């Protein structure tokens, strides 16, 4: 084997107008730790300033100087799609691949077979479903992610989109923008959240933060999860437990999807399960696009079974220009941005460095960061995932 | 002058462009039993509508027609409200009762009030009476009433939604998705987490306190000011930081929310001079009244980067002219004035409007919490929350739309 590694890092493009020389504000708020006690990332040092854009090609997650100083090769590219890409060419001899879920470099079974030297697939972000976990397990490849880095960010985004759907924000803003007023056109589809029932599939780090933020809105809170929360937490929040997600759906005005993507959860929202939803239900999905059958959502919107769908995640990513969720009525869509706010980037850039430092010094990666290690699901992977391949259709 | 039958003049907004809906997205509304703090829900003798129907538009008539005509009253409903010859101003000369909503307000200026020979009651179906010249009402012995707390919770939700939308850069990001882009860096170059930020509210009244309660779990620092300080127990539970004046509060805040009524004390309180007090890249959410903010001062602060965003549903005048600068500015989260008129809110203020009318026509006193002006002075909620004066100056620009 060898002591020097090729690190291949896939990042999204700089803004169309160029890498920013200024930002809207002087500083970021200080965050001391995560809810529940997990500490913030602890790299030995960082080479960036918090609040800077780190996730684009010019930002490089602040890793270049550290990696090159240790004699490694560091390759950064945004060109990820196809057999022809810079990514797939560099992939053959890469020891480490880094990408973000917002601009994911899909490690399919085929691509992993081509990556002869691959020892570590690192997600700068949360969720590894763009990596085929079964292949990684079989190859002894480590899969790691920076757990909890943007969980709270996404929770804010969920509550924002819930309110946006129920109150009919996006169509109302269009009227204001176009020179209209059109009150009746706006509120013909507009309700208060107060008194509604909201269910969450998975109360994990995001799901629980969502339930906490919804509590003062005086809604009824329902959830299901692979792992039940402690009674103290359920009593505090007035949570109503359900054994299965299908038992939960008919109770809910709003359903929010907070669960990772793996064979148990893939296309869990489909023509059949949508029949369990109340007429005029809302779905917010900030977890993974492929949790929902794309055309089933569209059909449910057109038939009135759903009063709205919003989320920032699509499949595949980037979404094709003709992807149907872009144009459907009653949509609150954004590109996949919620986990990559400037506040979040500072955290996953630091965590990325921490994981790499541990990896190259032969120290153990934090168990909470692990998805796959030593030929098995480990750490957060053992807790939140199941073995299998979720990358089908990413081409 | 005195008789048992009244002419009620009711100004409502137009039906949807495609026509009045006979069906809705959902089967019924959530049950709401009372308001936080104990004020009971409206108590009309009966209601002639189903909760969830569109009541605030001209075909909806606030569900009042059958009740009014059965008692021999004349009920005129119109959306034509702006200008000297509008249906509204012609019918106004002999009206005993005027009803309008803040979303499509029939401005009762001194001039209009002077022309209204029979006007005994100015009824706001909704909250905030600043579209009525209160000094003229006071002088004429006209009663001014509104349906207090009817949509306060609806607006607080709208506020949190817009704070999150501004801070996280929702509107521009959605634009990229709709136009076929992806463009992550363009979205998030302006995108921050709310967590850890400082949020101040001007006024913790029914809306302000509901906003503070909804913001608490987002782990922000909460600041506020008001004419009346909250009880120590409430400050303690929410970790609120009190300021005596709104100008002492601004320099601390990443985000400022305006929850205060419009009257001479608050008019244009956000202007070039007070904006110098804000942190760079501050956000303002204003769901209270458009005229709280000098409109061009807001535009200048957005263009200079003093503000990183401005959002709200309220404009001055209303409807906003097509060339109103807040329509085209960057970093805005604007909607037309809809937050207090969701289908859930309409059910409550329609019932409240009916309750006030029934009281008025039976000679029973209107609930104190509903009163703004009664018997020649600020009374009830009016005494608590308003100051005397005339806020309707410049409202004639609405006729432009
Ligand atoms: N929109 C974004 O930018 C963004 C950022 C983070 C996560 N996401 C996604 O959201 C997911 C959740 O994030 P998280 O931080 O809360 O992770 P988490 O591991 O803390 O929470 C996941 C929860 O899902 C539960 N789970 C797994 N399989 C389940 C099943 N079959 N049925 C019910 N529950 C199941 C787990 O028990 C766990 O509680 C992530 O895996 C990631 O894919 C999106
Ligand atoms: N966008 C909408 O649809 C909508 C619906 C309701 C009201 N608004 C507006 O919001 C305002 C507030 O509504 P509310 O239900 O909270 O009413 P509220 O009367 O309960 O609260 C008003 C608060 O403002 C305070 N106040 C009055 N003058 C003040 C001053 N000079 N400085 C500081 N505080 C002052 C009062 O003490 C009171 O606490 C209304 O007057 C109305 O104009 C908007």
CSV table of N, CA and C in Angstrom, one decimal, chain B residues 228-371:
chain,number,residue,atom,x,y,z
B,228,UNK,N,-46.8,49.1,27.3
B,228,UNK,CA,-47.0,48.4,28.6
B,228,UNK,C,-46.1,47.2,28.7
B,229,UNK,N,-45.4,47.1,29.8
B,229,UNK,CA,-44.5,46.0,30.0
B,229,UNK,C,-45.2,44.7,30.3
B,230,UNK,N,-44.7,43.6,29.9
B,230,UNK,CA,-45.3,42.3,30.2
B,230,UNK,C,-45.1,42.0,31.7
B,231,UNK,N,-45.9,41.1,32.3
B,231,UNK,CA,-45.6,40.6,33.7
B,231,UNK,C,-44.3,40.0,33.8
B,232,UNK,N,-43.7,40.1,35.0
B,232,UNK,CA,-42.3,39.5,35.2
B,232,UNK,C,-42.3,38.0,34.9
B,233,UNK,N,-43.4,37.3,35.2
B,233,UNK,CA,-43.5,35.8,35.0
B,233,UNK,C,-43.3,35.5,33.5
B,234,UNK,N,-44.0,36.3,32.7
B,234,UNK,CA,-43.9,36.1,31.2
B,234,UNK,C,-42.5,36.4,30.7
B,235,UNK,N,-41.9,37.5,31.1
B,235,UNK,CA,-40.5,37.8,30.7
B,235,UNK,C,-39.6,36.6,31.1
B,236,UNK,N,-39.8,36.1,32.3
B,236,UNK,CA,-38.9,35.1,32.8
B,236,UNK,C,-39.0,33.8,32.0
B,237,UNK,N,-40.3,33.3,31.8
B,237,UNK,CA,-40.5,32.1,31.0
B,237,UNK,C,-39.9,32.1,29.6
B,238,UNK,N,-39.9,33.3,28.9
B,238,UNK,CA,-39.5,33.4,27.6
B,238,UNK,C,-38.1,33.9,27.4
B,239,UNK,N,-37.5,34.2,28.6
B,239,UNK,CA,-36.1,34.9,28.6
B,239,UNK,C,-36.1,36.2,27.8
B,240,UNK,N,-37.2,37.0,27.9
B,240,UNK,CA,-37.3,38.2,27.2
B,240,UNK,C,-36.4,39.3,27.8
B,241,UNK,N,-35.8,40.1,26.9
B,241,UNK,CA,-35.1,41.3,27.3
B,241,UNK,C,-35.9,42.5,26.9
B,242,UNK,N,-36.2,43.3,28.0
B,242,UNK,CA,-37.0,44.5,27.9
B,242,UNK,C,-36.2,45.7,27.5
B,243,UNK,N,-36.7,46.6,26.6
B,243,UNK,CA,-36.2,47.9,26.3
B,243,UNK,C,-37.3,48.9,26.5
B,244,UNK,N,-37.0,50.1,27.0
B,244,UNK,CA,-38.0,51.2,27.2
B,244,UNK,C,-38.4,51.8,25.9
B,245,UNK,N,-37.5,51.9,25.0
B,245,UNK,CA,-37.8,52.5,23.7
B,245,UNK,C,-37.4,51.6,22.6
B,246,UNK,N,-38.1,51.8,21.4
B,246,UNK,CA,-37.7,50.9,20.3
B,246,UNK,C,-36.3,51.3,19.8
B,247,UNK,N,-35.9,52.5,19.9
B,247,UNK,CA,-34.6,52.9,19.4
B,247,UNK,C,-33.5,52.3,20.3
B,248,UNK,N,-33.7,52.1,21.5
B,248,UNK,CA,-32.7,51.4,22.4
B,248,UNK,C,-32.6,49.9,21.9
B,249,UNK,N,-33.7,49.4,21.4
B,249,UNK,CA,-33.7,47.9,21.0
B,249,UNK,C,-33.0,47.6,19.7
B,250,UNK,N,-33.2,48.5,18.7
B,250,UNK,CA,-32.7,48.2,17.3
B,250,UNK,C,-31.2,47.8,17.2
B,251,UNK,N,-30.3,48.4,17.9
B,251,UNK,CA,-28.9,48.0,17.7
B,251,UNK,C,-28.6,46.6,18.1
B,252,UNK,N,-29.4,46.0,19.0
B,252,UNK,CA,-29.2,44.6,19.4
B,252,UNK,C,-29.6,43.5,18.4
B,253,UNK,N,-30.4,43.9,17.5
B,253,UNK,CA,-31.3,42.9,16.8
B,253,UNK,C,-30.8,42.5,15.4
B,254,UNK,N,-30.7,41.2,15.1
B,254,UNK,CA,-30.5,40.7,13.8
B,254,UNK,C,-31.8,40.9,13.0
B,255,UNK,N,-32.9,40.7,13.7
B,255,UNK,CA,-34.3,40.8,13.0
B,255,UNK,C,-35.2,41.6,13.9
B,256,UNK,N,-35.9,42.5,13.2
B,256,UNK,CA,-37.0,43.3,13.9
B,256,UNK,C,-38.3,43.1,13.3
B,257,UNK,N,-39.3,42.8,14.2
B,257,UNK,CA,-40.7,42.6,13.8
B,257,UNK,C,-41.5,43.7,14.4
B,258,UNK,N,-42.4,44.3,13.5
B,258,UNK,CA,-43.3,45.4,13.9
B,258,UNK,C,-44.7,44.9,14.2
B,259,UNK,N,-45.1,44.9,15.4
B,259,UNK,CA,-46.4,44.4,15.8
B,259,UNK,C,-47.4,45.5,16.5
B,260,UNK,N,-47.1,46.7,16.2
B,260,UNK,CA,-47.7,47.8,16.9
B,260,UNK,C,-48.8,48.5,15.9
B,261,UNK,N,-49.9,49.0,16.5
B,261,UNK,CA,-50.9,49.7,15.6
B,261,UNK,C,-50.3,51.0,15.0
B,262,UNK,N,-51.0,51.5,14.0
B,262,UNK,CA,-50.6,52.8,13.3
B,262,UNK,C,-51.5,53.9,13.9
B,263,UNK,N,-50.8,54.9,14.5
B,263,UNK,CA,-51.4,56.2,15.0
B,263,UNK,C,-50.2,57.2,15.0
B,264,UNK,N,-50.5,58.5,15.4
B,264,UNK,CA,-49.4,59.4,15.2
B,264,UNK,C,-48.1,59.1,16.0
B,265,UNK,N,-48.2,58.3,17.1
B,265,UNK,CA,-46.9,57.9,17.7
B,265,UNK,C,-46.1,57.0,16.9
B,266,UNK,N,-46.7,56.1,16.1
B,266,UNK,CA,-45.9,55.1,15.3
B,266,UNK,C,-45.8,55.3,13.8
B,267,UNK,N,-46.4,56.4,13.3
B,267,UNK,CA,-46.4,56.6,11.9
B,267,UNK,C,-44.9,57.0,11.4
B,268,UNK,N,-44.5,56.3,10.4
B,268,UNK,CA,-43.1,56.4,9.8
B,268,UNK,C,-42.0,56.3,10.9
B,269,UNK,N,-42.2,55.4,11.8
B,269,UNK,CA,-41.3,55.2,12.9
B,269,UNK,C,-40.0,54.5,12.3
B,270,UNK,N,-40.1,53.9,11.2
B,270,UNK,CA,-39.0,53.3,10.4
B,270,UNK,C,-38.7,54.3,9.3
B,271,UNK,N,-37.5,55.0,9.4
B,271,UNK,CA,-37.2,56.0,8.4
B,271,UNK,C,-35.7,56.1,8.4
B,272,UNK,N,-35.2,57.0,7.5
B,272,UNK,CA,-33.7,57.2,7.3
B,272,UNK,C,-33.0,57.4,8.7
B,273,UNK,N,-33.6,58.2,9.6
B,273,UNK,CA,-33.0,58.5,10.9
B,273,UNK,C,-33.0,57.2,11.8
B,274,UNK,N,-34.1,56.5,11.9
B,274,UNK,CA,-34.0,55.4,12.8
B,274,UNK,C,-33.3,54.2,12.1
B,275,UNK,N,-33.2,54.1,10.8
B,275,UNK,CA,-32.5,53.0,10.2
B,275,UNK,C,-31.0,53.0,10.4
B,276,UNK,N,-30.5,54.2,10.7
B,276,UNK,CA,-29.0,54.3,11.0
B,276,UNK,C,-28.7,53.5,12.3
B,277,UNK,N,-29.7,53.1,13.1
B,277,UNK,CA,-29.6,52.4,14.4
B,277,UNK,C,-29.4,50.9,14.2
B,278,UNK,N,-29.7,50.4,13.0
B,278,UNK,CA,-29.8,48.9,12.8
B,278,UNK,C,-28.4,48.4,12.5
B,279,UNK,N,-28.1,47.1,12.9
B,279,UNK,CA,-26.9,46.4,12.5
B,279,UNK,C,-26.9,46.2,11.0
B,280,UNK,N,-25.7,46.1,10.4
B,280,UNK,CA,-25.6,45.8,9.0
B,280,UNK,C,-26.2,44.4,8.7
B,281,UNK,N,-27.0,44.4,7.6
B,281,UNK,CA,-27.6,43.1,7.2
B,281,UNK,C,-28.7,42.7,8.1
B,282,UNK,N,-29.3,43.7,8.8
B,282,UNK,CA,-30.5,43.5,9.6
B,282,UNK,C,-31.7,43.1,8.7
B,283,UNK,N,-32.7,42.4,9.3
B,283,UNK,CA,-34.0,42.1,8.6
B,283,UNK,C,-35.1,42.7,9.3
B,284,UNK,N,-36.1,43.2,8.5
B,284,UNK,CA,-37.3,43.8,9.1
B,284,UNK,C,-38.5,43.0,8.5
B,285,UNK,N,-39.4,42.5,9.4
B,285,UNK,CA,-40.7,41.9,9.0
B,285,UNK,C,-41.7,42.8,9.6
B,286,UNK,N,-42.6,43.3,8.7
B,286,UNK,CA,-43.7,44.2,9.1
B,286,UNK,C,-45.0,43.7,8.6
B,287,UNK,N,-45.8,43.1,9.5
B,287,UNK,CA,-47.1,42.6,9.2
B,287,UNK,C,-48.1,43.6,9.8
B,288,UNK,N,-47.7,44.7,10.4
B,288,UNK,CA,-48.6,45.5,11.2
B,288,UNK,C,-49.3,46.5,10.3
B,289,UNK,N,-48.6,47.6,9.9
B,289,UNK,CA,-49.1,48.6,9.0
B,289,UNK,C,-48.0,49.1,8.1
B,290,UNK,N,-48.4,49.3,6.8
B,290,UNK,CA,-47.4,49.7,5.8
B,290,UNK,C,-46.8,51.1,6.2
B,291,UNK,N,-47.6,52.0,6.8
B,291,UNK,CA,-47.2,53.3,7.0
B,291,UNK,C,-46.3,53.5,8.2
B,292,UNK,N,-46.1,52.4,8.9
B,292,UNK,CA,-45.0,52.4,10.0
B,292,UNK,C,-43.7,52.7,9.4
B,293,UNK,N,-43.5,52.4,8.1
B,293,UNK,CA,-42.2,52.5,7.5
B,293,UNK,C,-42.3,53.5,6.3
B,294,UNK,N,-41.4,54.5,6.3
B,294,UNK,CA,-41.2,55.4,5.1
B,294,UNK,C,-40.8,54.4,4.0
B,295,UNK,N,-41.6,54.4,2.9
B,295,UNK,CA,-41.4,53.4,1.8
B,295,UNK,C,-40.1,53.6,1.1
B,296,UNK,N,-39.6,54.8,0.8
B,296,UNK,CA,-38.4,55.1,0.1
B,296,UNK,C,-37.2,54.9,1.0
B,297,UNK,N,-37.3,55.1,2.3
B,297,UNK,CA,-36.3,54.8,3.2
B,297,UNK,C,-35.9,53.4,3.3
B,298,UNK,N,-37.0,52.5,3.2
B,298,UNK,CA,-36.8,51.1,3.1
B,298,UNK,C,-36.0,50.7,1.9
B,299,UNK,N,-36.4,51.2,0.7
B,299,UNK,CA,-35.7,50.9,-0.5
B,299,UNK,C,-34.3,51.3,-0.5
B,300,UNK,N,-34.0,52.5,0.1
B,300,UNK,CA,-32.6,53.0,0.2
B,300,UNK,C,-31.7,52.1,1.0
B,301,UNK,N,-32.3,51.6,2.2
B,301,UNK,CA,-31.6,50.7,3.1
B,301,UNK,C,-31.3,49.3,2.5
B,302,UNK,N,-32.2,48.8,1.7
B,302,UNK,CA,-32.0,47.6,1.0
B,302,UNK,C,-30.9,47.7,-0.1
B,303,UNK,N,-31.0,48.8,-0.8
B,303,UNK,CA,-30.0,49.1,-1.9
B,303,UNK,C,-28.6,49.3,-1.3
B,304,UNK,N,-28.5,49.8,0.0
B,304,UNK,CA,-27.2,50.1,0.6
B,304,UNK,C,-26.7,48.9,1.4
B,305,UNK,N,-27.5,47.9,1.6
B,305,UNK,CA,-27.0,46.8,2.4
B,305,UNK,C,-27.2,47.0,3.9
B,306,UNK,N,-27.7,48.1,4.3
B,306,UNK,CA,-28.1,48.3,5.7
B,306,UNK,C,-29.1,47.3,6.1
B,307,UNK,N,-30.1,47.0,5.2
B,307,UNK,CA,-31.0,45.8,5.4
B,307,UNK,C,-30.6,44.7,4.5
B,308,UNK,N,-30.6,43.5,5.0
B,308,UNK,CA,-30.4,42.3,4.1
B,308,UNK,C,-31.8,41.8,3.6
B,309,UNK,N,-32.9,42.3,4.1
B,309,UNK,CA,-34.2,42.0,3.7
B,309,UNK,C,-35.3,42.7,4.4
B,310,UNK,N,-36.5,42.8,3.7
B,310,UNK,CA,-37.7,43.4,4.2
B,310,UNK,C,-38.8,42.5,3.7
B,311,UNK,N,-39.7,42.2,4.6
B,311,UNK,CA,-40.9,41.4,4.2
B,311,UNK,C,-42.1,41.9,5.0
B,312,UNK,N,-43.3,41.7,4.4
B,312,UNK,CA,-44.5,42.0,5.1
B,312,UNK,C,-45.7,41.8,4.1
B,313,UNK,N,-46.9,41.9,4.7
B,313,UNK,CA,-48.1,41.8,3.8
B,313,UNK,C,-48.8,43.1,3.8
B,314,UNK,N,-48.3,44.2,4.5
B,314,UNK,CA,-49.1,45.4,4.6
B,314,UNK,C,-48.4,46.6,3.8
B,315,UNK,N,-49.2,47.4,3.2
B,315,UNK,CA,-48.6,48.4,2.3
B,315,UNK,C,-49.4,49.7,2.6
B,316,UNK,N,-48.8,50.8,2.2
B,316,UNK,CA,-49.7,52.0,2.2
B,316,UNK,C,-49.5,52.8,0.9
B,317,UNK,N,-50.6,53.2,0.3
B,317,UNK,CA,-52.0,52.9,0.7
B,317,UNK,C,-52.4,51.5,0.2
B,318,UNK,N,-53.6,51.1,0.5
B,318,UNK,CA,-54.1,49.8,0.0
B,318,UNK,C,-55.3,49.9,-0.9
B,319,UNK,N,-55.4,49.3,-2.1
B,319,UNK,CA,-54.3,48.5,-2.7
B,319,UNK,C,-53.1,49.3,-3.1
B,320,UNK,N,-51.9,48.7,-3.1
B,320,UNK,CA,-50.7,49.3,-3.5
B,320,UNK,C,-50.7,49.6,-5.0
B,321,UNK,N,-50.3,50.8,-5.4
B,321,UNK,CA,-50.2,51.2,-6.8
B,321,UNK,C,-49.2,50.2,-7.5
B,322,UNK,N,-49.5,49.9,-8.8
B,322,UNK,CA,-48.7,49.0,-9.5
B,322,UNK,C,-47.2,49.3,-9.6
B,323,UNK,N,-46.9,50.6,-9.4
B,323,UNK,CA,-45.5,51.1,-9.5
B,323,UNK,C,-44.9,51.2,-8.0
B,324,UNK,N,-45.6,50.8,-7.0
B,324,UNK,CA,-45.1,50.8,-5.7
B,324,UNK,C,-43.7,50.2,-5.6
B,325,UNK,N,-42.7,50.9,-5.1
B,325,UNK,CA,-41.3,50.4,-5.1
B,325,UNK,C,-41.1,49.1,-4.3
B,326,UNK,N,-41.9,48.7,-3.4
B,326,UNK,CA,-41.7,47.5,-2.6
B,326,UNK,C,-42.0,46.3,-3.6
B,327,UNK,N,-42.7,46.5,-4.6
B,327,UNK,CA,-43.0,45.4,-5.6
B,327,UNK,C,-41.8,44.9,-6.3
B,328,UNK,N,-40.9,45.8,-6.7
B,328,UNK,CA,-39.7,45.4,-7.4
B,328,UNK,C,-38.3,45.3,-6.7
B,329,UNK,N,-38.3,45.7,-5.4
B,329,UNK,CA,-37.0,45.8,-4.7
B,329,UNK,C,-36.4,44.4,-4.5
B,330,UNK,N,-35.0,44.3,-4.4
B,330,UNK,CA,-34.4,43.0,-4.2
B,330,UNK,C,-34.5,42.7,-2.7
B,331,UNK,N,-34.4,41.4,-2.4
B,331,UNK,CA,-34.4,40.9,-1.0
B,331,UNK,C,-35.7,41.3,-0.3
B,332,UNK,N,-36.8,41.1,-1.0
B,332,UNK,CA,-38.1,41.3,-0.4
B,332,UNK,C,-38.9,40.0,-0.3
B,333,UNK,N,-39.7,39.9,0.7
B,333,UNK,CA,-40.6,38.8,0.9
B,333,UNK,C,-42.1,39.2,0.9
B,334,UNK,N,-42.4,40.3,0.1
B,334,UNK,CA,-43.8,40.8,0.1
B,334,UNK,C,-44.9,39.9,-0.4
B,335,UNK,N,-46.1,40.0,0.2
B,335,UNK,CA,-47.4,39.5,-0.3
B,335,UNK,C,-48.3,40.7,-0.2
B,336,UNK,N,-49.5,40.6,-1.0
B,336,UNK,CA,-50.5,41.5,-0.7
B,336,UNK,C,-51.1,41.3,0.7
B,337,UNK,N,-52.1,42.1,1.1
B,337,UNK,CA,-52.4,42.0,2.5
B,337,UNK,C,-53.4,40.9,2.7
B,338,UNK,N,-52.9,39.7,3.0
B,338,UNK,CA,-53.7,38.5,3.2
B,338,UNK,C,-53.6,37.8,4.5
B,339,UNK,N,-52.7,38.1,5.4
B,339,UNK,CA,-52.4,37.3,6.6
B,339,UNK,C,-53.6,37.2,7.5
B,340,UNK,N,-54.3,38.3,7.7
B,340,UNK,CA,-55.4,38.4,8.6
B,340,UNK,C,-56.7,37.9,8.0
B,341,UNK,N,-56.6,37.5,6.7
B,341,UNK,CA,-57.8,37.0,6.0
B,341,UNK,C,-57.8,35.6,5.5
B,342,UNK,N,-57.0,34.7,6.1
B,342,UNK,CA,-57.1,33.3,5.8
B,342,UNK,C,-58.5,32.8,6.0
B,343,UNK,N,-58.9,31.6,5.4
B,343,UNK,CA,-60.2,31.1,5.6
B,343,UNK,C,-60.5,30.9,7.1
B,344,UNK,N,-59.5,30.5,7.9
B,344,UNK,CA,-59.7,30.2,9.3
B,344,UNK,C,-60.1,31.6,10.0
B,345,UNK,N,-59.4,32.6,9.7
B,345,UNK,CA,-59.6,33.9,10.3
B,345,UNK,C,-60.9,34.5,9.9
B,346,UNK,N,-61.3,34.3,8.7
B,346,UNK,CA,-62.5,34.9,8.2
B,346,UNK,C,-63.8,34.4,8.9
B,347,UNK,N,-63.7,33.1,9.3
B,347,UNK,CA,-64.8,32.5,10.0
B,347,UNK,C,-65.0,33.2,11.3
B,348,UNK,N,-63.9,33.6,12.0
B,348,UNK,CA,-64.0,34.3,13.3
B,348,UNK,C,-64.4,35.8,13.1
B,349,UNK,N,-63.8,36.5,12.2
B,349,UNK,CA,-64.2,37.9,12.2
B,349,UNK,C,-65.6,38.1,11.5
B,350,UNK,N,-66.0,37.2,10.7
B,350,UNK,CA,-67.4,37.3,10.2
B,350,UNK,C,-68.4,37.1,11.4
B,351,UNK,N,-68.1,36.1,12.2
B,351,UNK,CA,-69.0,35.9,13.4
B,351,UNK,C,-68.9,37.1,14.3
B,352,UNK,N,-67.7,37.7,14.5
B,352,UNK,CA,-67.5,38.9,15.3
B,352,UNK,C,-68.2,40.1,14.8
B,353,UNK,N,-68.2,40.3,13.5
B,353,UNK,CA,-68.9,41.4,12.9
B,353,UNK,C,-70.4,41.3,13.1
B,354,UNK,N,-70.9,40.1,13.0
B,354,UNK,CA,-72.3,39.8,13.2
B,354,UNK,C,-72.6,40.1,14.7
B,355,UNK,N,-71.8,39.6,15.6
B,355,UNK,CA,-72.0,39.9,17.1
B,355,UNK,C,-72.1,41.4,17.4
B,356,UNK,N,-71.2,42.2,16.8
B,356,UNK,CA,-71.2,43.6,17.1
B,356,UNK,C,-72.5,44.3,16.5
B,357,UNK,N,-72.9,43.9,15.3
B,357,UNK,CA,-74.1,44.4,14.7
B,357,UNK,C,-75.3,44.1,15.5
B,358,UNK,N,-75.5,42.9,15.9
B,358,UNK,CA,-76.6,42.5,16.8
B,358,UNK,C,-76.6,43.3,18.0
B,359,UNK,N,-75.5,43.5,18.7
B,359,UNK,CA,-75.4,44.3,19.9
B,359,UNK,C,-75.9,45.8,19.6
B,360,UNK,N,-75.3,46.3,18.5
B,360,UNK,CA,-75.6,47.7,18.1
B,360,UNK,C,-77.1,47.9,17.9
B,361,UNK,N,-77.7,46.9,17.2
B,361,UNK,CA,-79.1,47.1,16.8
B,361,UNK,C,-80.1,46.7,17.9
B,362,UNK,N,-79.6,46.0,19.0
B,362,UNK,CA,-80.4,45.6,20.1
B,362,UNK,C,-80.3,46.6,21.2
B,363,UNK,N,-79.4,47.6,21.0
B,363,UNK,CA,-79.1,48.5,22.1
B,363,UNK,C,-78.3,48.0,23.2
B,364,UNK,N,-77.6,46.8,23.1
B,364,UNK,CA,-76.7,46.3,24.1
B,364,UNK,C,-75.3,46.9,23.9
B,365,UNK,N,-74.5,47.0,25.0
B,365,UNK,CA,-73.2,47.6,24.8
B,365,UNK,C,-72.3,46.6,24.0
B,366,UNK,N,-71.5,47.1,23.1
B,366,UNK,CA,-70.5,46.3,22.4
B,366,UNK,C,-69.4,45.9,23.4
B,367,UNK,N,-68.9,44.7,23.3
B,367,UNK,CA,-67.8,44.2,24.2
B,367,UNK,C,-66.7,45.2,24.3
B,368,UNK,N,-66.3,45.5,25.5
B,368,UNK,CA,-65.2,46.5,25.7
B,368,UNK,C,-64.0,46.2,24.9
B,369,UNK,N,-63.6,44.9,24.8
B,369,UNK,CA,-62.4,44.6,24.0
B,369,UNK,C,-62.5,44.9,22.5
B,370,UNK,N,-63.7,45.0,22.0
B,370,UNK,CA,-64.0,45.3,20.6
B,370,UNK,C,-63.9,46.9,20.3
B,371,UNK,N,-64.1,47.7,21.4
B,371,UNK,CA,-64.2,49.1,21.2
B,371,UNK,C,-62.9,49.8,20.9
